């Protein structure tokens, strides 16, 4: 009764805690370089999934925000009928969707956030780049749990 | 069941078989675990643990419970007995007083001992409420069949008894309970150990000036600070504490919700407690920059979130977090 305040109190770079094999929780304090070996298996080889180039992307309403507020049509120009992962490889865009399924050439909007008034972030549509230019609208209403966005540059 | 010397025995320090040590104000749930100088529970021999043995005299008299009261500030709530030793839901108070009716007699013993009740959480309540969340408090048990601790209770020391040392009709006479081991002699010359039946006394004639003793040690006894050791030897007499400190969840705090308003990277919050509840957060840069402050004033408060993260503990109200950006 006149000790000091708990570490699950007054730790630095976001930490909980437990006396249980005293672990210190969910620290989120820079980068780990991780590195994978997939299962070859696992892959699908280049010429089946469809060739998506010949598209165009464009924003609709972005928002300018860490939950997935920002969207994006993408006129698809497929070759085959099928899914395709998505990335965005520049850290600005972080997407909801890590795959879209095509129809022979139709259109499917994804969600995603960004940091940066006017996102210029390419998205890899399974072998084919795009930029995804355009402007984005600042929300109202920030009183909930952590981003999705954490993309946080200049801008 | 032993008898002591209680400090403030109603009117001044008796010797009340319920003479009140080790008081334990020490859990969290409105208990105290209590030891009497008096063993209570079942009779001199078999049955009913709502029964009650106390020393009355050299003799026991092992009857009922009818009337028990522990109180302090205000009067206590009797949990369970068993032993030398009782558990009672308290409230706080500066002192413990204790004391049972006979039936001719109040016979109440009395103690200081600080007692507080702070429920286990960020909220300083005086007193368990009937909801809020549970979690893990620390208290006594209700049963027995414990094995947890067991204290020392090895044998009594002798006792006076000036009841014993009578008159022949010009000397001072002796006698014994049921052939008990009276340790006698006087400040003049006479028989020097007392190992005896009723003696008498050739030398000696005032009561006042003779060794009224009772080795009597058929049964242990708590080893009080107020009794006189049994010099011969530690005898056995291992015997275990009933009321272990365990780790249950007390039925405990909670602290009204509060009321969150949203402002530019800042979170005002009209807040209003139903006690002193201790608020804090962790600004989630490697910068902590936390705060500490026990609220029972309700207070609009202020707190700088950051872009990344914030969060917010409203007493044993669980954690909240915040996106601010």
């Not at chain 1, 305040?5 to 094999?21: K, M, Q, R, W, Y």
């Not at chain 1, 009928?81 to 990335?87: D, W």
């Not at chain 2, 006698?184 to 030398?203: F, L, M, N």
């Given at each position: 009764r006149?000790?000091?305040?708990?570490?699950?109190?007054?730790?630095?770079?976001?930490?909980?805690?437990?006396?249980?094999?005293?672990?210190?929780?969910?620290?989120?304090?820079?980068?780990?370089?991780?590195?994978?070996?997939?299962?070859?298996?696992?892959?699908?080889?280049?010429?089946?999934?469809?060739?998506?180039?010949?598209?165009?992307?464009?924003?609709?309403?972005?928002?300018?925000?860490?939950?997935?507020?920002?969207?994006?049509?993408?006129?698809?120009?497929?070759?085959?009928?099928?899914?395709?992962?998505?990335?965005?490889?520049?850290?600005?865009?972080?997407?909801?969707?890590?795959?879209?399924?095509?129809?022979?050439?139709?259109?499917?909007?994804?969600?995603?956030?960004?940091?940066?008034?006017?996102?210029?972030?390419?998205?890899?549509?399974?072998?084919?780049?795009?930029?995804?230019?355009?402007?984005?609208?600042?929300?109202?209403?920030?009183?909930?749990?952590?981003?999705?966005?954490?993309?946080?540059?200049?801008? | 069941?032993?008898?002591?010397?209680c400090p403030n025995c109603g009117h001044s320090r008796?010797?009340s078989?319920i003479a009140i040590e080790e008081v334990r104000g020490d859990a969290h749930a409105g208990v105290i675990r209590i030891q009497t100088?008096?063993?209570?529970?079942?009779?001199?021999?078999?049955?009913?643990?709502?029964?009650?043995?106390?020393?009355?005299?050299?003799?026991?008299?092992?009857?009922?419970?009818?009337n028990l009261h522990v109180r302090t500030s205000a009067p206590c709530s009797l949990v369970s007995h068993?032993?030398?030793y009782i558990l009672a839901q308290c409230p706080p108070g500066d002192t413990v007083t204790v004391g049972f009716?006979?039936?001719?007699?109040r016979?109440t013993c009395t103690v200081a001992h600080k007692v507080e009740f702070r429920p286990v959480?960020?909220?300083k309540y005086r007193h368990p409420p009937?909801?809020?969340?549970?979690?893990?408090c620390n208290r006594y048990?209700?049963?027995?069949?414990?094995?947890?601790?067991?204290?020392?209770?090895?044998?009594?020391?002798?006792?006076?008894?000036?009841?014993?040392?009578?008159?022949?009709?010009?000397?001072?006479?002796?006698?014994?309970?049921?052939?008990?081991?009276?340790?006698?002699?006087?400040?003049?010359?006479?028989?020097?150990?007392?190992?005896?039946?009723?003696?008498?006394?050739?030398?000696?004639?005032?009561?006042?000036?003779?060794?009224?003793?009772?080795?009597?040690?058929?049964?242990?006894?708590?080893?009080?600070?107020?009794?006189?050791?049994?010099?011969?030897?530690?005898?056995?007499?291992?015997?275990?504490?009933?009321f272990?400190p365990?780790?249950?969840?007390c039925?405990?705090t909670?602290?009204?919700?509060?009321?969150?308003?949203?402002?530019?990277?800042?979170?005002?919050?009209?807040?209003?407690?139903?006690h002193p509840?201790?608020?804090?957060?962790?600004?989630?840069?490697?910068?902590?920059?936390?705060?500490?402050?026990?609220?029972?004033?309700?207070?609009?408060?202020?707190?700088?979130?950051?872009?990344?993260?914030?969060?917010?503990?409203?007493?044993?109200?669980?954690?909240?977090?915040?996106?601010?950006?």
């Amino acid at each position: 009764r006149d000790k000091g305040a708990p570490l699950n109190d007054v730790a630095p770079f976001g930490c909980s805690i437990a006396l249980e094999p005293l672990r210190a929780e969910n620290c989120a304090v820079g980068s780990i370089p991780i590195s994978i070996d997939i299962p070859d298996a696992a892959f699908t080889r280049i010429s089946e999934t469809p060739t998506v180039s010949d598209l165009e992307c464009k924003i609709t309403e972005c928002t300018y925000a860490s939950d997935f507020g920002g969207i994006a049509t993408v006129a698809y120009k497929s070759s085959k009928a099928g899914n395709c992962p998505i990335h965005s490889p520049s850290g600005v865009a972080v997407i909801k969707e890590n795959d879209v399924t095509l129809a022979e050439s139709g259109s499917f909007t994804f969600h995603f956030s960004t940091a940066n008034i006017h996102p210029a972030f390419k998205l890899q549509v399974c072998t084919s780049a795009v930029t995804c230019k355009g402007d984005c609208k600042p929300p109202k209403d920030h009183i909930v749990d952590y981003p999705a966005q954490h993309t946080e540059s200049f801008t | 069941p032993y008898i002591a010397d209680c400090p403030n025995c109603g009117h001044s320090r008796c010797d009340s078989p319920i003479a009140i040590e080790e008081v334990r104000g020490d859990a969290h749930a409105g208990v105290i675990r209590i030891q009497t100088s008096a063993m209570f529970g079942l009779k001199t021999d078999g049955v009913d643990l709502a029964y009650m043995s106390f020393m009355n005299g050299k003799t026991q008299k092992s009857i009922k419970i009818d009337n028990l009261h522990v109180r302090t500030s205000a009067p206590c709530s009797l949990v369970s007995h068993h032993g030398y030793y009782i558990l009672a839901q308290c409230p706080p108070g500066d002192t413990v007083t204790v004391g049972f009716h006979d039936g001719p007699n109040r016979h109440t013993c009395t103690v200081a001992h600080k007692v507080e009740f702070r429920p286990v959480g960020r909220e300083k309540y005086r007193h368990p409420p009937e909801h809020g969340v549970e979690l893990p408090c620390n208290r006594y048990t209700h049963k027995r069949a414990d094995q947890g601790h067991y204290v020392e209770m090895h044998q009594p020391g002798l006792v006076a008894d000036h009841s014993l040392l009578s008159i022949h009709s010009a000397k001072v006479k002796i006698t014994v309970p049921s052939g008990a081991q009276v340790k006698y002699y006087c400040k003049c010359p006479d028989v020097r150990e007392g190992i005896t039946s009723s003696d008498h006394t050739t030398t000696c004639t005032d009561v006042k000036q003779c060794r009224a003793y009772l080795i009597d040690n058929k049964k242990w006894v708590y080893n009080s600070g107020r009794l006189p050791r049994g010099e011969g030897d530690t005898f056995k007499g291992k015997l275990h504490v009933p009321f272990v400190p365990v780790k249950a969840k007390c039925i405990a705090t909670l602290a009204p919700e509060p009321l969150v308003e949203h402002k530019h990277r800042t979170l005002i919050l009209h807040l209003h407690p139903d006690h002193p509840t201790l608020l804090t957060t962790r600004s989630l840069g490697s910068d902590a920059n936390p705060t500490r402050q026990w609220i029972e004033r309700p207070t609009t408060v202020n707190f700088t979130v950051t872009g990344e993260g914030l969060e917010y503990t409203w007493g044993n109200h669980p954690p909240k977090r915040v996106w601010a950006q």
